[PDB]
Design a protein around this nucleic acid. Structure first.
Lengths: 64, 101, 708, 149
RNA sequence: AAAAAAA
RNA sequence: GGCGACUCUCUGGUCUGUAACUGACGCUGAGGAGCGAAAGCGCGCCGUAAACGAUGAGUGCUAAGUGUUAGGGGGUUUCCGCCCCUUAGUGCUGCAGCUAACGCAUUAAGCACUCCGCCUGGGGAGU
């Protein structure tokens, strides 16, 4: 259970990378919890902004 | 005569309605556990769910549907069976949605 | 309504009628009208209300009279009550009470009748008659009672003892383990009578635990005198006469890749990459059919045994250890009589050319899976230097295996990866360690080659249209799969298939999607519960799990009797050219009984291997008391919770140990729901647990909710 | 809490049958086992003189036909009032066999008990009379309410 | 409770 | 008191590191001013408040163990990883000491110093 963002030297998550963020949502769209993706709290928060910015511009869907 | 459509299943604890619409939300057909002649306990069951689901589905296939988007409401036990019943009728299901507040 | 209700009843009353669902009824009866469909339902309401047609829990309809005599297999409980598994398994478990089981034993075939009452969720069965006796013999400890004897069955599933008269004591004292040839059975209130068969030895002996299971399951044992005579007469070296009509392959680079403890080396492997980008794969299989000829003593025993069985501490081989580990074994650096399959495979994994022939190979080296991984994955130079002649071949082997896998996945094969485990015991049978059986690249390499070899042989003999044995896997059970497809809709997935005709690819497409999610272990577990078993059969019915229409077992004749049969059929049809009608009719008569028997012997073996694993798994953890572990919720039954520790060891957690709350099983959403505290325990959740009760004898392990 | 052991009666000295003794003890009044030992030995000489068969062949046949297989037991859980069909334990079969044999033999029209007991045994053996009927009666009744159990 | 496949 | 969709605009504070600078510029703070619930009631006033983690602010000192948040230094090691040290915050457990007891325990209710607020039997009465 490793942080993908730390592990791969990533500092800035980008709301435009749709397939990158897609690894961190369910099929419905729900943001998958830290306990299940193993993300670091720092990045979980960066990740979540990005997902929501994604959702606003219809790159990702809304929940169920 | 339309191909693509939505199926708005309302499975409550008391009843299962199943409407099917077009993409614009105009009703093509519908059925329900009560209109299936089930009464009381039986309207709650997932048996009555599939009955209604198929009854309205076969009504939709007459108008010539093929693909269904599904939307579900309510906490009833019928959605599971009803959605399989839309696949078992012949109509292929794409996007599922659970719009339960 | 009345008209149809009678017409439907008349149709259902026909002798050939079987249980039909609402949709299936209006297909043979035939209905197409929308208003006649509105007529069906209130009619089904009426017939079911009047008690003229009963709903089977699988939503199939049949007259109370049709089900009345379910005639299911007795699924009896250890405490003394029972459930039932009806002929068609579509029907649910019918409850048989202690008072009305009327001399029925766990696994016998009966004719249980329905009750017009039910004090619970279950239909009330009653053994009005026993259609068939099963449990012919029991194993157990003999105990002296009131100047009498009484063998107590090994299992607690038989709630009574077995009356031993003195003429059937035959050794059995307070201690001695013995099998019982039951010479009589229960009678209202009386118990079953018997004798004493094999004095296994004192019950509290190390190696009786195995030996007790050896006789419990009815596993094979010691080779008959005529088989051991034939084995002793079999040459330790190849005769120069046997080299005739065989292709020399000794000067080629041919090697074996197996587990570290494998002595029964069935298969050899060589790969050459051709200039056009295709690969040439040489699969060479130990020619057991040469030594073990048809109707020989070893052959009749090998049929009786059916397969090798691999218990934790020992192997019970299908053919004698002198042959299996000696002349048949592809031991390193010797001539070896082998039936070969040589295949040219293109860049899409398709076998362009193939040839099946008799041959003799010189095993250049005996390799381990661990060594081959270190060569290919870890890039280990020390092992490369040691096996320098093989290193170029292993690289060509890795590429071909990838091509074959890529084909096999694109064809739609279903590749679960449930972590199997290898219990590690010493020679005395003490469990020193238990670890996961890691199928890495080298195992997956050999797997793919054996698969393509097996597919190629099976395909060839399908098109030859001669009697042949296949390894089939049917399509999954449509009722169990229906529950699986519902279950995966809880998470919002849609599977492009029906419960009647689902394509393997669709089930893989779920397994890929769920990879690394909270719906991974749950789905995968419910997909298994909908899967079936594979079996041998003379008909080419296809292998659902491998998504191919032509499959057989060719690549392990030392340890599987259907592989030794294929070898004989290869020698009959291809080598000897005997495709005459009389030869076909002879094999067509013999194969169904061999296939059904060998499939029964495989299931018996696997059950026994698992039983010994679970046994020594407890033996390993007879010192884990108190010690907390972080292990995931593997199953949620209504009678508790089941937690797999990382090392594939499961244990129980009843509401007895769910001390905080009064939890409840949600079947639809596979989970434990507490209310008084408002808790949620789904399956696949990483949680902590403590070992409380490892009772080895019944193979129990218990946990308690340390937490989540 | 643990089923009390039934009293081990001696075998009847002339037929070596603990069944026949149990009949004597069933027939015995006011501890007059003598009167009942006489009556039976008088009744079995009557059976042997009429039939020609051994009294034991007839008496065992008589019991077979009187002995019940299923009985009605009152169960009143909540409402219920269920006449639960209960299988008669092999000891209670003989019990009810001998009880009915004696009870109906005493009620018969014949002058002496030795004749009354003889005739009830002879009727029981021919699958007829009143004691056989009584078994049928409770089985007819147990069949009537057989849907419980 | 326990799928392929291998040992 | 509070503050949770996203973006932009404007704007306040805190933490870490380095020490380039200033050189005690510091602490507390009656009164006063401002902020400040459902109140209560016509955006305005009102502004009392389990507005009680039931614990004033500032500072220094006095065992440990373990988790988490935001940083820093180092170590091997390719970064990562894993270990060690460290600053600030936030938890759990736990000495010495303290306590009527319960407990608190480097986020003290310990050991000290400065300054503020406050208490002096229960009703009557927050009249």
């Amino acid at each position: 259970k490793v942080c993908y963002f730390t592990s791969n030297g990533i500092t800035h998550i980008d709301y435009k990378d749709v397939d990158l963020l897609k690894k961190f949502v369910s099929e419905r769209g729900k943001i998958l919890p830290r306990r299940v993706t193993g993300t670091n709290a720092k990045y979980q928060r960066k990740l979540t902004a990005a997902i929501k910015r994604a959702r606003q511009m219809a790159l990702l869907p809304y929940v169920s | 005569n339309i191909e693509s459509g939505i199926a708005h299943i309302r499975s409550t604890f008391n009843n299962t309605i199943v409407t099917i619409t077009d993409t614009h939300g105009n009703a093509i057909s519908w059925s329900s556990a009560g209109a299936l002649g089930f009464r009381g306990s039986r309207k709650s069951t997932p048996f009555a769910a599939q009955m209604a689901a198929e009854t309205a589905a076969k009504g939709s296939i007459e108008h010539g549907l093929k693909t269904l988007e599904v939307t579900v409401k309510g906490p009833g036990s019928g959605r599971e069976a009803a959605i399989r019943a839309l696949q078992a009728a012949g109509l292929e299901v794409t996007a599922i949605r659970d719009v339960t507040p | 309504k009345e008209a149809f209700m009678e017409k439907l009843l008349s149709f259902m009353k026909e002798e050939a009628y079987k249980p039909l669902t609402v949709q299936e009824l209006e297909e043979m009866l035939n209905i197409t009208e929308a208003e006649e469909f509105k007529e069906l339902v209130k009619a089904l309401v009426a017939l079911e209300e009047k008690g003229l047609i009963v709903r089977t829990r699988s939503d199939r309809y049949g007259i109370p009279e049709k089900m009345n005599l379910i005639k299911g297999k007795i699924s009896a409980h250890a405490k003394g009550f029972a459930f039932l598994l009806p002929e068609d398994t579509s029907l649910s478990d019918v409850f048989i009470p202690p008072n009305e089981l009327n001399t029925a034993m766990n696994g016998d075939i009966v004719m249980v009748r329905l009750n017009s009452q039910s004090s619970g969720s279950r239909q009330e069965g009653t053994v009005i008659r026993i259609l068939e006796r099963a449990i012919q013999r029991v194993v157990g400890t003999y105990t002296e009672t009131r100047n009498f004897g009484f063998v107590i069955p090994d299992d607690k599933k038989i709630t009574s003892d077995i009356f031993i008269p003195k003429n059937g004591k035959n050794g059995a004292a307070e201690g001695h383990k013995v099998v019982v040839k039951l010479t009589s059975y229960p009678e209202g209130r009386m118990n079953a009578e018997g004798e004493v068969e094999t004095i296994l030895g004192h019950k509290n002996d190390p190696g009786i635990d195995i030996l007790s299971v050896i006789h419990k399951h009815g596993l094979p044992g010691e080779f008959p005198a005529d088989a051991m005579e034939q084995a002793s007469s079999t040459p330790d070296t190849i005769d120069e006469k046997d080299l005739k009509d065989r292709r020399d392959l000794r000067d080629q680079v041919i090697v074996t890749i197996d587990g570290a403890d494998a002595k029964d080396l069935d298969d050899a492997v060589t790969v050459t990459k051709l200039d056009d980008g295709s690969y040439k794969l040489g699969v060479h299989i130990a020619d057991v059919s040469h030594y073990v000829t048809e109707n020989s003593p070893i052959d009749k025993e090998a049929l009786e045994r059916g397969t090798s069985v691999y218990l934790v501490d020992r192997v019970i081989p299908m053919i004698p250890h002198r042959l299996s580990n000696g002349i048949c074994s592809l031991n390193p650096k010797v001539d070896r009589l082998t039936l070969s399959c040589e295949m040219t495979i293109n860049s899409q994994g398709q076998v362009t050319e193939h040839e099946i022939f008799q041959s003799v190979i010189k095993t250049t080296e005996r390799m381990t899976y661990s060594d081959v991984n270190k060569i290919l994955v870890d890039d280990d130079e020390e092992l490369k230097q040691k096996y320098e002649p093989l290193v170029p071949m292993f690289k060509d082997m890795e590429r071909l295996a990838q091509i074959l896998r890529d084909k096999r996945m694109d064809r739609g094969a279903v590749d679960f990866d449930f972590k199997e485990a290898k219990v590690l015991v010493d020679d005395e049978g003490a469990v020193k360690d238990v670890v996961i059986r890691e199928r890495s690249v080298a195992e997956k390499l050999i797997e793919e080659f054996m698969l393509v070899a097996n597919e190629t042989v099976a395909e060839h003999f399908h098109w030859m249209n001669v009697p042949f044995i296949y390894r089939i896997h049917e399509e999954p059970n449509a009722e169990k799969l229906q529950k699986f497809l519902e279950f995966v809709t809880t998470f919002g997935y849609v599977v492009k298939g029906t419960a009647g005709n689902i394509h393997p690819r669709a089930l893989q497409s779920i397994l890929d999607a769920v990879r690394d999610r909270p719906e991974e272990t749950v789905i995968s577990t419910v997909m298994l519960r909908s899967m079936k078993q594979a079996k041998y059969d003379p008909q080419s019915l296809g292998h659902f799990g491998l998504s191919t229409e032509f499959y057989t077992h060719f690549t392990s004749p030392i340890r599987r009797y259907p592989d030794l049969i294929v070898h004989r059929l290869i020698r009959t049809y291809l080598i000897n050219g005997k495709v005459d009608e009389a030869t076909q009719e002879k094999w067509a008569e013999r194969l169904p009984d061999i296939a059904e028997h060998t499939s029964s012997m495989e299931r018996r073996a696997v059950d026994a291997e698992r039983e010994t694993d679970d046994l020594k798994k407890a033996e390993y953890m007879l010192d884990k008391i108190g010690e907390e572990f972080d292990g995931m919720i593997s199953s949620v039954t209504n009678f508790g919770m089941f937690v797999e520790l990382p090392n594939t060891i499961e244990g129980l957690v009843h509401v007895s140990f769910m001390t905080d709350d009064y939890y409840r099983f949600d079947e639809q959403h596979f989970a434990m729901i507490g209310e008084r505290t408002g808790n949620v325990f789904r399956i696949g959740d990483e949680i902590t647990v403590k070992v409380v009760d490892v009772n080895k004898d019944e193979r129990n392990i218990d946990f308690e909710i340390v937490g989540m | 809490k643990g089923p009390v052991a039934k009293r081990d009666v001696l075998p009847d000295p002339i037929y070596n049958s603990k069944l026949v003794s149990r009949l004597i003890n069933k027939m015995m009044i006011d501890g007059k086992k003598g009167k009942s030992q006489t009556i039976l030995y008088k009744s079995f000489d009557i059976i042997k003189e009429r039939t020609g068969n051994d009294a034991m062949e007839v008496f065992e046949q008589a019991l077979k036909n009187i002995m019940p297989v299923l009985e009605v037991k009152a169960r009143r859980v909540g409402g219920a009032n269920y006449q639960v069909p209960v299988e008669v334990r092999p000891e209670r079969r003989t019990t009810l066999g001998l009880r009915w044999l004696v009870n109906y033999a005493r009620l018969r029209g014949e002058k002496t008990m030795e004749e009354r007991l003889a005739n009830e045994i002879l009727d029981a053996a021919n699958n007829t009379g009143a004691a056989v009927k009584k078994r049928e009666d409770t089985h007819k009744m147990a069949e009537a309410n057989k849907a419980f159990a």
